[PDB]
Amino acid sequence: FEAPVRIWHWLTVLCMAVLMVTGYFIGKPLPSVSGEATYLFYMGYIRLIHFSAGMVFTVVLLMRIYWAFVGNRYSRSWWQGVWYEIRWYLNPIAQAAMFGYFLMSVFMIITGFALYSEHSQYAIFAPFRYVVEFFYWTGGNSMDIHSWHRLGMWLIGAFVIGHVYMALREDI
Amino acid sequence: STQYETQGYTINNAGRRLVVDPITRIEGHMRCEVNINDQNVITNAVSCGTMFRGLEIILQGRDPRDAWAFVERICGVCTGVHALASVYAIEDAIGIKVPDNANIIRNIMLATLWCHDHLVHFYQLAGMDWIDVLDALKADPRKTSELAQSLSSWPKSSPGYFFDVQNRLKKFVEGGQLGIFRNGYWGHPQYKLPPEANLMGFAHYLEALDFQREIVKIHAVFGGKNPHPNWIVGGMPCAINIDESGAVGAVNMERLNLVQSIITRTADFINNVMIPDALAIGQFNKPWSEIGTGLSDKCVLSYGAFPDIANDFGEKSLLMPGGAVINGDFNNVLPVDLVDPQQVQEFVDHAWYRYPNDQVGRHPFDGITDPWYNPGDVKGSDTNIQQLNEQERYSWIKAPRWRGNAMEVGPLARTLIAYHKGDAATVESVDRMMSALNLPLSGIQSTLGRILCRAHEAQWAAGKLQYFFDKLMTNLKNGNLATASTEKWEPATWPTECRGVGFTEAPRGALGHWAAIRDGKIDLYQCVVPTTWNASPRDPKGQIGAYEAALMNTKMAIPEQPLEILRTLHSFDPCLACSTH
Amino acid sequence: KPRIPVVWIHGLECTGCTESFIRSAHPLAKDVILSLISLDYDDTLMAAAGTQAEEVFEDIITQYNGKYILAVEGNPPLGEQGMFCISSGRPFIEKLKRAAAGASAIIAWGTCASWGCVQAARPNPTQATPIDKVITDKPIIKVPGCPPIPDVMSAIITYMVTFDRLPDVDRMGRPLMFYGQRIHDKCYRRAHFDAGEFVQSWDDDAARKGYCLYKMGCKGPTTYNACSSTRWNDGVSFPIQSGHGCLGCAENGFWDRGSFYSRVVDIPQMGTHSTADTVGLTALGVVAAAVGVHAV
Amino acid sequence: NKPRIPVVWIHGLECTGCTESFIRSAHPLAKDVILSLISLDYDDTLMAAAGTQAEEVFEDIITQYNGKYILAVEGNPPLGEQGMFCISSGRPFIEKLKRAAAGASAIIAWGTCASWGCVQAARPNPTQATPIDKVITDKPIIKVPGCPPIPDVMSAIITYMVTFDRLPDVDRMGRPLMFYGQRIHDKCYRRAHFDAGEFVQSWDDDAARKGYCLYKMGCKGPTTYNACSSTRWNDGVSFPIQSGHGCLGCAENGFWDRGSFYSRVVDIPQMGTHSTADTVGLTALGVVAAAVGVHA
Amino acid sequence: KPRIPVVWIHGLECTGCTESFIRSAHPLAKDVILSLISLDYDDTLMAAAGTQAEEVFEDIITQYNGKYILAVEGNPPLGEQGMFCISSGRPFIEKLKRAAAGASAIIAWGTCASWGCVQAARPNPTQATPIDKVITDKPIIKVPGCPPIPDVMSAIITYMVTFDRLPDVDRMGRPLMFYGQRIHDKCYRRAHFDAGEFVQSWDDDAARKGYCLYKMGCKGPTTYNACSSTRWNDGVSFPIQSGHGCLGCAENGFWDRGSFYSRVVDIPQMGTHSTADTVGLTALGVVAAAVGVHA
């Protein structure tokens, strides 16, 4: 068994809200506590909720993308790119927004997993270890992965401020 | 050829030219050129820094709190001293006062570096100029033992021990793989130690090579690692916990016990191995108490160091005295001010840099580091220097002057300053040393004197270590544990614009960092480093620096083998990455 | 028996890597030099200078051509035709290339030779370049760190001598044995990290109990090295243990990765001091502007 | 000169491991402790006098320096067989202990033996071995547990008491806060693996060869207070976990009877980040794979 | 057993600190003097005067050299060669240095000895200088306040006698026990501060209900001392409790920190009820005015 099609959107939103709130505090952690670190795991739980929200998010996102593809794009190699451009200068800047949004999510996954699979996951995560070499090729290290990952989160939050105001503008 | 008069010297570049490139058994990259007359005497000397990195440029725009970490990498040999200067400077600019323990620990870090740096230089750098390593193969172990035991209390002196050392060396060479000893100057007539003294020396070289690693454990406790320990603006990051839960995660009694154990061992090695060896080289190389005087009987400089009163850099606080002497007038030790635009200035008219007017010197607050490699005609091409044109630009080192005077800095300089300021401990110490050598006080102002003063400094520093440690422990007994001031850590608390100076005495002499902060970022960062002073090129007056002065009038027994040049230069303990940064 | 010939050259450097090498506790640097290898050229330690030093260099690389190990400390500058670093009146890069040509393998000591280190930081006045950007036809073992751990340096040396082979390396050319894991993967303060127990300002109660230094900017989480296990100077300590966060000194371009004291750091390809919060919050406030202007 | 503080070191039922540990001290060396910090006036293991000469020393010290000496106690008294399970000078050891404690200013209880009872007190405690604090009730007793305690911890506690002229601050159990304030598990360099859910499952597996956590091999780190993970053993060379064996819990009361050493600790929170998130991912990947029809 | 010798000297001061000391409720100053220490020199209380007093001074610092505690009230003036404060025809600073030289530790009583206090305020006519600027080679325990709390003074004394050690101190040399926290962090009026409930003028309704004195210039938020917990004169009161804001009298250079009746700066302040009352009326007025009932 499964459910209605809007479940697989409210999920992503739930995942998104969690990956943001948690990922935020992985980089700018909450105030410090004090006790006996045997019985305390606050930061560890934030990271855990993050990685596994990122698991769910990743699965849902990829199935949700697989269908839009199979179904022609949306509506029920740079040619199409250069042509998207001519008709693009005349709602055409709103599609490129929803597209950029799904492009970010995938970037947040490629980068997010490069970090997660690092300490020798040694299985199906083998490709993500090109992302690392790439950032090294850039003349950087895995710290840059963290930085670009944190940036992606802010960029997503930008669309969300737009996409939310744009939706609430459908309070006709 | 050109001919001219400066500071009592005749600078004459006629005659034969000699090139020593690379200068080895120094830090970094140096090129030296000389001219000798028909008698084989040096009539012209050229000091050339053959490297540049540009830290002053790299520090532009960065966070003042990060500065120490960048500048520390100016030099891995005098590791830590630039970081000390940097935190001094930034704390001067912002107006930060560090806790007592933080100051004591910083003094310990400096003292530790003095002990380590002096020791390694004596044996691993300068040592083979005086010790004929291959001649040690001809020594009698039993006699070597008797010599060693006549000079020191040190336990490691058995005939069997020297025999073992001699055998290890003999085996080592019998393979033709002489390594670091290959193509040396062994058998040079200036090698004056008897075979037994060479064996003793070489054994101690090995002992020093081993033991130097232990000294820096003090840096590892308080600064995490060596080379390049860690520091913070506002004090030190090594929080102290003696008597409370979690002391395992801080500097505790056990950590302090380790520090105490290193201090004892360090003073013991310096006093009974290095000191007697320095004294021994003195006994066998007395003519060198009259060679390589240079500027040391004319102009010497010290900023002073080791503030014993926290945040007080005045005369009542610095345990190592500061001051300047010019024109050989050692009877008036002049006060030094690093803010005064009239005192410290740098000239680039003979260096590979650009000024709006290269005929004037710039105080570091007005400093400019604009590098341009422009050698002029160098009897070669631009990538094939056969001879530096010492008339024009010939070095990556700036030319520092104090009130227009060329100065010598370092252990000898400091000793003279302290001596003539009437520091009782210093006076007594120096007179004893010279009395033992049956030399006048003047004998210190020489190539030999530099080496002697360095050794004496190591002994001074080792003594100081224990002093500082005791000060720390007294604070701890009194419940004074604070190691940092956090109050003005946040850039929001800083003045919008401010500037400061950080100074201390590095192993090689007077060090200064000049820093200007604007809007929480570094607007200016200029460094004048001890070897910058000593290895300085000429100025618009044609005045020569410490190295060039010291090499003047020097007799060479064989010019195809620059042993006398090496002896004098090495006596300064050149650090070229420091000089150029 | 004969020992393997080693040529140790120096480019732009602070000589910290050489200094580290002689700190080795086991084996002692003394025993390495005397018994394990033949240190045939090394400016810092050799007796010969000038033309005598040059003769040694040419003689070693010629007589032991294709058989010696080249150890490289520092890096070559490309600026001013290479004359930012001059050796025997010529650009250091020529020496490097000449030495590399006859080497059977090359050791890149420290962050300098591996990556570029401090002189290569913005704006790299001299165009300091890591060795592997210049020498592309030789096996290069990167042993990064500023400097690397003394006993790591010697362990790598003893490995190559004893096992007569190069150590296995990661995709970056670093030996897996000491650089296969991150500091954060073996840091004794991890218990505090995961508990959310952090030092917030220097010398607070948290610092006095040895709490995690993540909020003080520790770059342990992204830095591969052995410091948290092997430790420094005969296992006495390492940066974090003495209360300062890891700077990331073993990592490529760590100098230009923002403040050492901040979690969110400079993105070089995007301005002078623009970080992910800078660029990110600017974009968030710019949409809020559009979203509130249009809504009136 | 200066007199040193008189120290009387007595031995009950023990293995003499604590005395051995004491002389392992790296800083200060045991030699210097004996020479300069204290006056070790009685100690069966080291003293020249035996028999009636030893008895005379004992009597003379505790009488002359009555109320002014420190009593160090290694081992513990047996209550069984009227105390004749441990006989000193033809009398029950407990009589010696009581006589020594009556004149002491303060008592140091070396090791788990004196602190708790250790191995001889394990089920069924044939001799009724009893910790010192159960016998002596009117004197300050500083418990320095461990089997044995860390050498440098022992000397540090001694140097503390000499230098600062006072007893170290203690928990409710009498252990010095300085070294027993935290758990092994809270300063263990393998926490990263614990926290990730990366465990050794059997000896010398790939996990063990990478130095993964030993929680599932029975490590009692999570319930053991000691300094082994920070201070470390034998001049900071190693500690049990670092050399691949889990903590036995040897600093803790009755640790011998807390089940097998290879049995997992209980009531310790443990939820791995990567272990949980790997499960969450496959659970979701497998739910989808089932619905699509590419199950297995 | 003999009692620890204490030498109590006086520089430029008001004798407020000596007065405070004798206010001690527990232990009584009487019992401190008879049973806990040996107050061997103290100009205010000793019988001997002139040459007799000088003889006592010399005898104590000689006989008990290296073993006595030096208690310092007031401070030395550097102006006029030190002759702004004259003791036995000579500058007080000479007696200070002499007494310091033989002391094992120095207690700097009050703001005067610790910092400078009122005489060091602008323009410091006599160049009054705190003890730690003059004596640099001795442990100095600063016990600031004008004067310090009587029972804090005696508690510090009893600590050093009973525990035979100096109290742990901050980086400023203040005993952590009584100076580790700010007045504002233990003030019984913090509820009002946090609510935004302030006295605005003297004897208003807010003052008669014991509201916060932040707006009346209370320097509590920047002052380290124990007045809000230990309180004054056997726990009877402290400045804020009797309706006056903290002057900051335990802090360095507090006399020159602007008027006492001027608000303190860079202290975060955001009321709970003062903010929520504002958000409410902003919303209610936007609403009531739209409906039409602005009246």
Ligand code: HEM
């Ligand atoms: C909308 C998608 C996501 C958002 C908004 C998000 C947000 C964040 C943020 C802000 C950080 C902190 C970066 C820093 O300051 O260092 C972070 C860390 C991280 N994220 Fe994500 N993330 C997302 C997706 C993912 C995914 C799919 C994964 C894959 C498992 C992932 C794995 C990680 C990891 C491994 C870290 C750092 C863990 C650590 O070392 O503590 N993220 N995330």
Ligand code: SF4
């Ligand atoms: S101090 Fe650094 S390496 Fe250690 S646990 Fe914290 S972040 Fe990780």
Ligand code: SF4
């Ligand atoms: S269970 Fe043991 S091995 Fe694992 S982190 Fe805890 S103390 Fe270390």
Ligand code: SF4
């Ligand atoms: S400002 Fe003054 S009256 Fe108000 S809470 Fe703070 S200390 Fe008390």
Ligand code: FCO
């Ligand atoms: N000593 C030293 Fe290095 C130089 N010159 C510095 O500073």
Ligand code: F3S
């Ligand atoms: S700063 Fe470098 S020394 Fe190790 S702890 Fe970090 S890699």
Ligand code: F3S
């Ligand atoms: S067994 Fe004992 S030795 Fe330490 S590691 Fe556990 S407390």
Ligand code: F3S
């Ligand atoms: S005025 Fe002084 S008395 Fe206390 S309340 Fe303020 S510190």
Ligand SMILES: [Cl-]
């Ligand atoms: Cl030794």
Ligand SMILES: [Mg+2]
């Ligand atoms: Mg400079």
Ligand code: NI
């Ligand atoms: Ni240097």
